[PDB]
């Protein structure tokens, strides 16, 4: 049916676009974890 084709292609887009969102999230988490470790490592300027 036409409605079943609508829901099929919408569920497929939901899965694909959530996968894209998850890959973007892993990249931004790489950004954030690396910035987290730089701030854990960096001593302040008056000490340096």
């Amino acid at each position: 049916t036409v409605i079943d084709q609508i829901l099929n292609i919408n569920a497929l887009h939901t899965v694909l676009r959530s996968l894209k969102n998850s890959a973007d999230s892993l990249e931004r988490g790489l950004i954030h974890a690396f910035m987290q470790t730089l701030l854990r490592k960096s001593p302040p300027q008056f000490i340096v």
Binding site: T1, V2, I3, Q5, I6
Partner: protein
């Protein structure tokens, strides 16, 4: 008063398949117009 005669009978089920129009209205408006296309194309003419 009882006879037996040959009558032109149906043998298969009828169809009703939606169009894209009906799928669109079913999702947006929670409803179906039946004969939506005949209904549509007799709008501005005299034979409403």
């Amino acid at each position: 008063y009882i006879s037996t005669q040959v009558v032109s009978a149906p043998i298969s089920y009828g169809h009703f398949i939606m169009g894209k129009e009906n799928a669109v209205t079913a999702i947006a408006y929670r409803a179906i117009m039946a004969d939506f296309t005949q209904f549509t194309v007799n709008a501005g003419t005299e034979q409403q």
